[PDB]
Design a protein around this nucleic acid. Structure first.
Ligand code: MG
Ligand code: MG
Ligand code: MG
Ligand code: MG
Ligand code: MG
Ligand code: MG
Ligand code: MG
Ligand code: MG
Ligand code: MG
Ligand code: MG
Ligand code: MG
Ligand code: MG
Ligand code: MG
Ligand code: MG
Ligand code: MG
Ligand code: MG
Ligand code: ZN
Lengths: 287, 304, 152, 211, 108, 166, 148
RNA sequence: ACUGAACUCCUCACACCCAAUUGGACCAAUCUAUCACCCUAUAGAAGAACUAAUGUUAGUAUAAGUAACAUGAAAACAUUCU
């Protein structure tokens, strides 16, 4: 059952948090220098595997909590709610930076994962929804993609407008829930413990674990929903302000099964658009 | 934090969004130029008792006009700028005495309207209008919403009511607002030159409602009644209305046929739903004149 | 009722307001950047751009010499107006000054403002930048433009 | 102000002339500004007789017992904020150094059995006796807040403490009291603290830049 | 004219606590990206403009030293140069204001 | 003179149990004899009564009134003594729970009027009181809907009794 | 008045009359000065009448304290935790017998206003009035201007 | 016929609705005498009781944050200009 999948997968996620926190050396304290343009050179003498970059923001100001979205922890993009590991240097990255490449990418991945979180809880109990992946789609393409495999019953099905409107209502309902993103860097073996009932994600974790010199695989969680991704994510679901599931396409080389690709587009609370500009960005995001 | 459309755009995108949204505005306006090549609502003939649509125009300014008796008649110019029919409600869903057409004028930026309003014009297929005015109208005159309304809807010889908001004069005192006489300058008269005198009497221990006092003169809807159309300019969509129209220049006026009891059966020769240039029958000249109007280009008139 | 009245009444008369704008305009031809209250700043902006437009009539035009003799209360600034400011701006036809707002004056909380002349040696003001082109929305609209170039 | 010299120079600039007046009563201090000779951890029997000629009944073979009972009892008075006992148990150079920062917070220090026989280390010497004692004990701390929430150390877990406690005695009515506590630079750091700390950088004036 | 009675604190509280007399929460407020001091929209950052004011102050002091007395406004354009900088090929025929500190990160 | 507000940062609570939620800190700071009036301080004090301290600092850096700078001095000083003296780990994690303003000890001066008559000016002083509380600010009270009004009206209809009988 | 004072409904403690009657007064506490004219009639109450009172109802336990008080009191404590302290300062022996018998007779309810002079808990026996008593039904349950 | 009072009846309790005036029973607090001893008693005395004198003195309101008040301009705060 999908409810059973939430219970068993979330319980394995909590076993990974339990076997992740209990190896701490009783609150070791590492310092991290705020290397940035503004407020320069303030060390945060913080906890080892407890504190997040959001805690550094909570030491600085509410402005750096609300506005800052990723953290360059030594030149690499890091989640704002990811636990730190060692002594390092933190930049904070917002949408309105001069070169916000990784923030756009993390917003892109986060919106795709929220989309799949809507899709897997969209259908009635007799239709098997089976999510494969999100491809790394550039922002200039106009729409984040999320490839979805459905059952053979819906092989000759195409959603109406009001089906997609119900998907947007479920996604805005998921924005209103204000859910943070739990993150866990896990080895490959427990990731295969979690996603053992979906062959596409088994092969996907087999892609991600072999890419690294370790068998390290990122895992994420919104609420009751665990998904794999490629990079960092947004701190919360509350940041996505405008959200629309625009269209559904079907891939052309479908001999075994329809890898049915879903299209979405979204803008944050910071980069709002006007109603007419947003309608034109809906006219572009259906390809 | 309240935003606006120019806020998060770079210098690359601002002329792109300006020219692009303006181009969809001109394309959506030019898509309505074939109302009869669409499926309109059926055209009924005129009947004694029927009412038709008005217009919404701009007050361009005034200019003199001379009749063949050699008399100045001062004339306001009213340009009809992108007037359209926006929604029809019958007398059932209006619960009034008569049906109603919401008709709008003067296309306005899509970035300064409410989202419900932009959903209304997004459904309708037009750029949003500045003013919506509502015309009481019978079932015989009912054009499809979205049809353009032109200046030849009115013809010369027709008498016309024109309503608008008058020029606002703000908090004006008693003499400028109600024309009271005030007090003499000299012979004492310490601090009274422009004041109201008494207000009520001593036995009435209060002031009656509707008492003339200082207050905000102007900026309210008034209507001028019975104003003859001397000339319409078809190429620029101008009405040449007799006399004076309420309101400042470049204000939007609501131009309907006159309700006067001496001018209530002269719609026999007017185009009754509206004028359709799509109908192509006997295309109108550059400018339509009344019988009295001394045209420019006519020789200098002689009274013999 | 002041519809179309376009001049701020200032000072203690029309004469004293034109002496206020003459002193502010003299101070900006001299120092090339001024903090002043905002109404005096945009009134004097209107006079300042026309003052350059008389600067472009040439050193030899006696009308413009009477005008620059009037408006510049210090006399050393008149060779600056005909040999520095007017050759600086001979490329463009308008938009000579720029205006920004200061935070308000700490004395009386007045709406303050800076006008400078564009293109000078002074440290440039923290000008309000647009959001940079690589932000999320600007890349979505860049994608929309890259589609609507591919429609020809 | 920040020092005596700023108050004296503002006494000269303000014109407030303070004449130095002589009073017959001076301050009868009972302490020292620190340690006479700072013991450095990894022959002074003349000072022992310089204690026995003022005290006349003094046994060092019984002293690190009493040094324990002066130590622990003083820290028991931190559990109850019994300052009236502390001024009998601790010196005045030590009393702000152990009771000031513990104000408005409940400590629940508790001793449990020692690990070594505590022992005397060195002795030095109007006349101020001074005995440094090595202790290696097992203590438990729990320092709370005004709001009674833990901010340093669990109450249950015992920790092993190195202690170089320096005693001083006034040599007609004084007794042995804790004077200082030598912390050596080779010592390991203390417990880590439960919360995180932001440490600000240089607050920049607008003309200044960060380098 | 004199008040006939004394207004009470319940009437007075209804007067001086309505939202027309209360201060509006304003939402113009941002963070300046260059300094991190919170600025306002449509208004320059006071910290960054204080930088610019103090540097224009020292520059105008050295202008006032290099001119000497009133009524010495040049017919020549001006170039501010800092320590360790050659006057440009474009700066030929312009007067030069040598400074003592370095080129700022924000002067260009 | 009473000075009971300085004392309120001295109330020490007994240490908690394992089975007890974490108590939010409370930080009482005030300034005395501010030369400003007590009901021009009410508007600035009222402005910030539920906002977080970073939002309140944002609202008081940009207000034109004289008291805004003084309240920003009080809030910065209470944020510093919040971190140092009172064991509040995050600077940003503070909201203004109470911001009031009493009157201070004023003075009386003579104001000369147009004849031998005169008046008695007061040189008006005030105080400014603040309780900061550790934590996120409480949410603003949502306006009650037609569901809440309908349930309240029907609950009143269910409440009523036959009156002046058994 | 009645709008400034609270009010209550007429009740008893644990249905005080139904099965058996229970004396609601637990303790009396006399405090009577040995030497003092204030507690003279209290002393004459202890010498004469508090023993016969203590025997006329044995469910009351009585504590005469006999301390140097300056105003004598009696403290009646009731079964429901109510404590009514009344002064016997300069009152004669008969007035203390009526006062103590008054405290014995009543209960530990408040002496605030009682709203109704009665308390049924089953007020209606034939069924309470609703607007469809005294209205006849019609055939097929039809309402006015209903055809079918 | 009903309604309808402070009249009258009814259950219990009764000295318990007039101005000026007059008769009487008590009595707050204070001091004194003597008791008393978490605030009293019997007497004796007296600067012996304030919702009101355009009362006096002090405090703080209301009117009211109102009427009124105050700094020529730029700048290097050297200076210059009006
Ligand atoms: Mg006069
Ligand atoms: Mg007079
Ligand atoms: Mg003025
Ligand atoms: Mg006063
Ligand atoms: Mg009756
Ligand atoms: Mg009677
Ligand atoms: Mg009676
Ligand atoms: Mg007496
Ligand atoms: Mg008296
Ligand atoms: Mg009184
Ligand atoms: Mg009276
Ligand atoms: Mg009085
Ligand atoms: Mg007031
Ligand atoms: Mg004012
Ligand atoms: Mg008033
Ligand atoms: Mg005034
Ligand atoms: Zn800034």
């Amino acid at each position: 059952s999908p409810t059973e999948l939430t219970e068993m997968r979330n319980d394995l996620f909590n076993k990974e948090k339990a076997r992740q926190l209990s190896l701490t050396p009783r609150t070791e304290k590492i310092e991290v220098k705020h290397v940035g343009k503004t407020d320069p050179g303030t060390v945060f003498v913080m906890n080892k595997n407890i504190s997040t970059p959001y805690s550094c923001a909570m030491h600085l100001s509410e402005w750096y909590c609300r506005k800052s979205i990723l953290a360059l922890v030594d030149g690499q993009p890091w989640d704002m709610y990811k636990p730190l590991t060692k002594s390092c240097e933190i930049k904070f990255l917002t949408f309105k930076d001069c070169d916000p490449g990784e923030v756009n990418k993390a917003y892109w991945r986060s919106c795709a994962m929220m989309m799949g979180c809507v899709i897997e809880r969209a259908f009635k109990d007799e239709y098997m929804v089976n999510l494969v992946r999100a491809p790394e789609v550039p922002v200039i393409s106009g729409a984040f993609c999320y490839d979805v495999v459905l059952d053979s019953k819906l092989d000759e099905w195409m959603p109406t407008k009001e089906n997609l409107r119900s998907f947007t209502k479920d996604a805005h309902a998921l924005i209103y829930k204000d859910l943070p993103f739990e993150t866990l860097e896990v080895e490959a073996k427990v990731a295969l413990e979690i996603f053992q009932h979906s062959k596409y994600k088994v092969d996907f974790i087999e892609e991600k674990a072999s890419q690294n010199p370790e068998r390290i695989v990122k895992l994420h969680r919104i609420g009751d929903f665990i998904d794999v991704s490629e990079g960092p994510l947004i701190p919360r679901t509350s940041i996505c302000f405008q959200y629309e599931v625009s269209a559904v396409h079907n891939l052309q080389p479908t001999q075994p099964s329809l890898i049915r690709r879903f299209q979405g587009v979204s803008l944050p609370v910071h980069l709002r658009a006007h109603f007419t500009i947003w309608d034109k960005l809906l006219e572009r995001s259906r390809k | 934090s309240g935003t606006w459309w120019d806020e998060h755009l770079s210098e690359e995108n601002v002329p792109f969004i300006k020219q692009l949204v303006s181009d969809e505005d001109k394309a959506q306006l030019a898509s309505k130029l074939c109302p009869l090549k669409d499926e309109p609502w059926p055209i009924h003939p005129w009947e004694p008792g029927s009412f038709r649509v008005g217009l919404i125009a701009l007050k361009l300014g005034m200019m003199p006009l001379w009749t063949k008796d050699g008399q100045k008649h001062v004339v306001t110019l009213l340009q009809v700028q992108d007037c359209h029919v926006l929604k029809y409600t019958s007398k059932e869903n209006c619960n009034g005495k008569m049906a109603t057409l919401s008709v709008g004028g003067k296309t306005v930026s899509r970035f300064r309207k409410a989202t419900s309003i932009l959903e209304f014009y997004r459904e309708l297929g037009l750029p949003p209008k500045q003013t919506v005015k509502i015309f009481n109208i019978t079932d015989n005159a009912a054009i499809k919403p979205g049809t353009p309304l032109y200046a030849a809807h009115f013809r010369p010889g027709q008498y016309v009511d024109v309503t608008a908001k008058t020029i606002g004069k703000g908090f004006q005192g008693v003499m400028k607002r109600w024309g009271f006489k005030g007090q003499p300058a000299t012979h004492g008269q310490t601090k009274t030159h422009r004041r109201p005198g008494a207000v009520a009497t001593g036995d009435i221990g209060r002031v009656w409602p509707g008492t003339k006092m200082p207050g905000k003169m102007g900026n309210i809807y008034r209507t001028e009644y019975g104003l003859k159309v001397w000339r319409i300019n078809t190429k620029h969509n101008i009405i040449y209305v007799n006399g004076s129209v309420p309101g400042h220049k470049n204000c939007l006026v609501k131009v309907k046929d006159s309700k006067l009891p001496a001018y209530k059966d002269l719609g026999k020769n007017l185009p009754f739903p509206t004028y359709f240039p799509d109908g192509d029958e006997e295309e109108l000249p550059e400018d339509l004149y009344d019988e009295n109007v001394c045209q420019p280009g006519a020789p200098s008139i002689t009274f013999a | 009722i002041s519809h179309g009245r376009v001049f701020r009444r200032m000072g203690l008369g029309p004469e004293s307001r034109i002496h206020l704008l003459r002193n502010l305009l003299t101070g900006l031809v001299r120092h090339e950047r001024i903090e002043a209250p905002w109404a005096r700043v945009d009134e004097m902006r209107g006079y300042a751009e026309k003052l350059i437009d008389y600067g472009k009539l040439g050193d030899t035009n006696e009308r413009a010499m009477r005008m620059a003799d009037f408006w510049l209360t210090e006399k050393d600034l008149i060779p600056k107006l005909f040999q520095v400011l007017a050759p600086r701006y001979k490329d463009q036809t308008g938009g000579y000054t720029r205006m920004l707002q200061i935070p308000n004056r700490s004395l009386d909380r007045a709406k303050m403002a800076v006008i400078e002349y564009k293109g000078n040696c002074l440290p440039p003001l923290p000008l309000p930048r647009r959001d940079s082109h690589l932000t999320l929305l600007n890349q979505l609209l860049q994608g929309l433009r890259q589609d609507l170039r591919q429609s020809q | 102000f920040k020092t005596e010299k700023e108050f004296m120079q503002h006494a000269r600039k303000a014109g407030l002339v303070i004449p130095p007046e002589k009073s017959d009563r001076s301050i009868h201090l009972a302490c020292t500004a620190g340690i006479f000779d700072a013991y450095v951890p990894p022959a002074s029997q003349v000072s022992i007789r310089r204690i026995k000629d003022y005290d006349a009944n003094f046994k060092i073979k019984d002293f690190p017992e009493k040094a324990k009972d002066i130590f622990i009892e003083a820290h028991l008075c931190l559990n109850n904020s019994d300052h009236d006992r502390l001024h009998t148990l601790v010196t005045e150079h030590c009393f702000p150094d152990m009771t000031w920062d513990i104000k408005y917070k409940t400590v629940r220090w508790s001793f449990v059995e020692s690990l070594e026989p505590s022992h005397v280390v060195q002795v030095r010497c109007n006349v101020y006796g001074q005995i440094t004692v090595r202790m290696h004990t097992r203590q438990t701390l729990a320092i709370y807040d005004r709001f009674g929430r833990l901010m340093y150390g669990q109450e249950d877990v015992p920790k092993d403490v190195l202690e170089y406690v320096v005693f001083e005695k006034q040599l007609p009515y004084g007794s042995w009291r804790m004077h200082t506590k030598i912390v050596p630079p080779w010592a390991p750091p203390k417990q880590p603290i439960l919360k995180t700390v932001m440490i600000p950088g240089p607050q920049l004036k607008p003309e200044e830049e960060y380098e | 004219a004199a008040p006939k009675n004394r207004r009470t604190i319940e009437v007075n509280r209804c007067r001086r606590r309505n939202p027309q007399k209360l201060i509006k929460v304003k939402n113009n407020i941002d963070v300046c990206p260059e300094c991190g001091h919170l600025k306002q929209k449509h208004v320059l950052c006071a910290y960054c403009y204080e930088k610019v004011c103090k540097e224009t102050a020292e520059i105008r002091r050295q202008i006032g030293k290099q001119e000497g007395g009133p009524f010495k406004a040049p017919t020549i354009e001006t170039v501010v140069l800092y320590t360790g900088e050659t006057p440009s090929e474009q700066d030929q025929g312009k007067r030069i204001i040598e400074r003592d500190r370095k080129r700022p990160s924000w002067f260009t | 003179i009473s000075r009971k507000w300085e004392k309120k940062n001295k109330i020490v609570y007994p240490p908690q149990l394992p089975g007890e939620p974490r108590r939010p800190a409370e930080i009482y700071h005030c300034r005395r004899q501010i030369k400003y009036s007590k009901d021009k301080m009410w508007y600035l004090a009222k402005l910030i009564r539920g906002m977080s301290i970073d939002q309140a600092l944002a609202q008081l850096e940009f207000n034109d009134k004289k008291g805004a700078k003084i309240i920003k001095e009080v809030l910065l000083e209470a944020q510093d003594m919040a971190v140092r003296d009172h064991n509040v780990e995050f600077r940003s994690n503070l909201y203004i729970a109470e911001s009031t303003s009493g009157r201070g000890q004023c003075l009386k001066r003579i104001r000369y009027h147009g004849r031998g008559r005169f008046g008695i000016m007061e040189k008006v002083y005030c105080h400014y009181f603040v309780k900061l509380v550790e934590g996120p600010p409480p949410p603003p009270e949502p306006p009650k809907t037609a569901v809440a009004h309908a349930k309240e009206y029907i609950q009143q209809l269910r409440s009523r009794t036959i009156v002046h009988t058994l | 008045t009645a709008r400034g004072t609270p009010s209550r409904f007429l009740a008893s403690v644990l249905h005080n009359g139904l099965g058996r009657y229970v004396q609601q007064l637990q303790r009396l506490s006399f405090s009577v000065s040995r030497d003092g004219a204030s507690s003279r009639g209290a002393r004459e109450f202890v010498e004469r009448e508090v023993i016969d009172f203590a025997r006329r109802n044995p469910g009351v336990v009585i504590y005469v304290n006999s301390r140097p008080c300056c105003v004598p009191r009696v403290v009646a404590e009731y079964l429901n935790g109510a404590v009514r302290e009344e002064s016997i300062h300069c009152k004669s022996v008969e007035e203390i017998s009526t006062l103590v018998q008054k405290l014995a007779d009543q209960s530990g309810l408040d002496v605030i206003r009682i709203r109704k002079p009665f308390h049924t808990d089953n007020p209606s026996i034939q069924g309470q009035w609703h607007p469809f008593t005294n209205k006849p039904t019609t055939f097929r349950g039809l309402r006015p201007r209903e055809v079918q």
